[PDB]
Structures are given as structure tokens and as C-alpha cells.
Amino acid sequence: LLRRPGEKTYTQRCRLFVGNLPADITEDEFKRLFAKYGEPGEVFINKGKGFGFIKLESRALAEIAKAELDDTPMRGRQLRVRFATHAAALSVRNLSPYVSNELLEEAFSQFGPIERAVVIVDDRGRSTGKGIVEFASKPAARKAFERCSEGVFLLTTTPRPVIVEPLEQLDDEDGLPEKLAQKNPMYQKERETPPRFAQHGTFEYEYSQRWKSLDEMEKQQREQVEKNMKDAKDKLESEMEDAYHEHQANLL
Template sequence: MPEGENSQVANAQPPAQANTAPAPALNGVKCETPAQKPAQNTEAKAAPGPNQPADSKPHPYSHAQNQKPNQRAVQNNRPNQAQNGQNRNQPMKRFNPVGGHKNQPEAPVGEKKFTGRCRLFVGNLPADINEKEFRELFARFGDLGEIFLNTQRSFGFVKLDTRLNAEHAKQELDGHTFKGRCIRVRFASHGAAVRVKNLSPYVSNEYLEQAFSMFGRVERAVVIVDDKGRSIGEGIVEFERKPSATQCINKCTENCFVLTSYPKPVIVEPLEQKDDEDGLPEKSINKNQQFYADRESVPHFAANNSLELEMALKWRDLYELEKQIKEEGLKKVQEAREQLEHDIEFRLIDYKEQKIKEDLRAKQEELLRIEDMRKNEFQRRKDMDGAGK
């Protein structure tokens, strides 16, 4: 604690209602008030460390003086924060929910900077653009990270510090004319992202991130939920580097990676990324001959008794057949899932029962061994007493 805080605590005045005047002497013997008596049980109290807070020291107006001696002794025997290498100004270290190791700090809270979600793709760039001009084009939106520029194919990538700044840059520069070219700005696909399936409903974003950090640094981990905030059993993990994602997929495919006590391994697959925000603007469609042939007709309903209606109904029948096959397949999978869960539950119960029996048998054997030792010791003493007589 800083010296200023120590001096404030040391010079603190007692409350107005407390009687702190020294007691008068009786028969020449000076009496001490409870506040003036020396602290008891000093042997059990550890010496204060260099970072020990001031409130851990005995204070004349502390409520500890009003406690019973045995209560003060219990408090004195408790380890303080200074002995554990912690103080008030340091964040409390907690248990790691994945490994179960003590003193493992939790993942930092807040948005991480310069992640894959902040990376933009810039297309239709002028052929004579250089890296300095490309950097100046995005510099006003925030701090810039890595930059890649391919002048031969007129595209580039730029990574900004935050997602918000990247969204601002995309909104302002998409469709912007630069050196006579209408540039296109979109979010780049995250090449180090994976999809995780078979998640327990008790796996959170933080738990998922710490579980997959064993494969490499994780930029973002999120559990997908429905409209009611309940987990659908799937999640997305975005790594900082692509080799980490590749290693994660390979190891989880070759082995069974289980996140909780329930023996259900997660399924890890490459993330199939889709753009459901910008979609396909009209300006991005290639205006070729097929485009104009397809646009000859405006949106309409097929006329009755027409060839167009006949062909359209065939496409609808094909869709209904596909839907029916998928529903039948999902029904069979659900039945197999329920049967597997029932078998696993029965197997776990049987395993626990066998484990209890083995433990009971081992304890019985230990009791018999102790009983034999007791009998042998009794017989040895009896023989010694007989030999002494």
C-alpha cells in the first residue's frame, strides 16, 4: 500500500462516540483500556509482508477487539493476502475451469484487437496504387495491422484494430471511387475458424475458449444459441493462426476430445463461411449474356396449364422429396441418439456399481490385514510375557 494510505490509517481519529480517554489510576496502578491493551495471540499471527494491506494490521478501533479470544486466534491463523503474493490492487486468481489447476487467471475480458474479424478484403483497386496510398486510404479509421497488396490482380487485405473501426471503414469505402475505380470492400473470410458440434448445454463461451486454447491462441469463441438464449449444441472457435485450426481438426478427428464429464466427444469441422449481411448487390453481378437472358422476364406467377407451370411443379416435387428424405434421416438419427444415451447411462451406472464393489472389497481386505496384525501383535506380547515369567 502507498505511504499516503498508511499515514492516513495510522493517523485516523477514533469515532466521536467512543470513549478513548485513558482510565484513571487506582491505588497507584495504571489501568489500561481495551484499546490500549496489547494484542493477544501474537505468536499465531504472521509478520506482515511488503504488500500487506493496512487493514490486516491490528487497529485499536477494529471490531476484532470485541471478539472472543478463540475467534481472534482463528483469524490470526488465517493466511492473509500478502502471504499468498496478492494484494487488493491485483486481480483475484481463480480456478481454471478446464484443467482444474489453482492460481490460473481467467481469460481477459474485453474485445481483442487486430483479430481475423477485423480483416477487410479490398477489390477493384487501381493498378498503379502503392502500399503508402493503400495505407493512407484506411489510416483515418483506426490503427492498422498487417497489410497485403496485389497490384497485378487489383486487390488487397488490411487489418484494423477493432471490429467497429473495420465496419466503419467498410461502410464508408465500399463503392467509393478511388483514382477512377469503384473499389469494393468486404470482410475477409476467417481462414483459421472451426465449427464445434456436440457441445454440452453447460459449455459457455469462456469455457469453450479455454478448452480450445490448448491448440493455439484463440481470438474468439462463441456458443450458438437459439432465440431463447439456449445452446443449440454448436459453437465457433476462431484461432489466431491457421496451423492451430488445422492441428485442432486433425487431433479431434484422430482422437476423442471430451470437454465435460459426460463421455460425448465434440466434432470439429472447418467453418463453412457465408455472407448473410451484404449478400450479392446488383453492382457485383457480372453483366454477361446469360444475365440479360435471365432478366428478360419480370417476377410473376406461372400461368395455369402452361409449360412453365409444369416444369415448376417438377422442381417443387423434387424439393418435397428431398425434405422428406432429410426428415426420415433425422428421425432415425434421433432414435439412435436416444438409444445411445440410454446405453451410456446404464453403462455408467454399472461402472459405478463395480467401482463401489471393488472399493468395498479392498477395504474389507485392509480390515482383515489390520486384524491379523493386531492378533499377531497380541500373540507376540503374550509370548513375551510368558517367557518373562
């Protein structure tokens, strides 16, 4: 806590979700659970449903608390500690490859207080044309979402409207454990045949080979649509440049 971790502290990236809390949990007890991770930020406890949230000062402190407190006992119950899913986050796409984390953040700060913006890069450190914008409040995210949908928001010279969408937040951490899968009645009949390579001549081999052929055809039709629409977007660009005499002087 001596030196600031950066520009913003106690952000939603610093928020932890804590599940399986005992029924008699108190705010003091919950705060004491996190006492070694510095001064607590906002605390929200759902005593009736056994869960709470806490904001720590930095992402590193939340990472340590999560690693140290996850799956530890509290009065006969194993606490479940996880990063709280971001409640005020947006997906952005159609970005120029020359938009940086800082340009995206500066650009989106006009909609309200911003925590972070990032341009998603591939293994080479090159822009994928997609990014993430994390706001300090849900209204700021709603306004960014509405305004960029209704208007044309441009970040650089080349006119590329930023396309703002809800951020897909899927669980690739816990997934579907065997404990829940077992609760299904058709599960027993499903696990009856072990993983295998289907063999030539069998119905399952023939069905699977035809299925794969349809999937390959679907991939080819999807890639074609992309190409077809890439050409319509290039033709639109050319017609509009001519309509607006983009390379030429003209009074009207």
C-alpha cells in the same frame, strides 16, 4: 486507442479486404487511405492483382473504415471494401446447451492462440448446439480440426464429442448482381417470361406441383433419417451404459 477494446486487438475479425486498387499503388498510399483509423496492423498488398488487406486495432474501427471507404474513388476507380473472410475459422457442433462462449474459447485455446469462440443462439438466446471458433493462426485451426476428428473432445459432463468442420463461408452480402447475370447466353430466354403464379391446367403448374410433392417427400425422408439415427444414438447410449455398468459398482 486509449482503452483496449477487449482482450484481443488486430484480430482477423479486424481485417479488411480492399479491391480495385490502382496499378501504381504504394504501401504508403494504402496506409494513408486508413490513417484516420489509428495505428495500422499487418498490411499485405497484391500490387499485381489490385487488392490488399489491412488489420485495424478493433472490430469497431474496421466497421467504420468499411462504411466510410467502401465505394469511394481512388484515381478513377471505385474501391471495394469488405471484411476479409476468416482464414483460420472452424465450425463446431454437437455442443451441450450449457456450453457458453467463454467455455468454448477456454476449451479450444489449448490448440493454440485463439481470437474468439461463439455459441450460435436462436431468437430466444438459447444455444443451437453449434458454434464458431476463430484462431490467430492457420496451424492452430488445423491442429484443433485434426485432433477433434481423431480423438474424442468433451466440453462438459455428458459425453458429447465436439464435431469440428470447415466453416461454410457463403456470400449473402453482394450475392449475384444483375451485371454478371446478364453475361449468360440463356439469360435472355430465361427472363423472357416474367415472375408469375402458374395456373391450373398448364404443363408448368403440373410439373411444379409434382416437383413440390417430391421435395415434400424428400423433407419427410430426411426428417425420418434424423429420427432413425436419434433412436440408434439413444440405443447405443443405453447399451454402452450397461456395458460399462455406469450406475453400478463392479471390480472389472
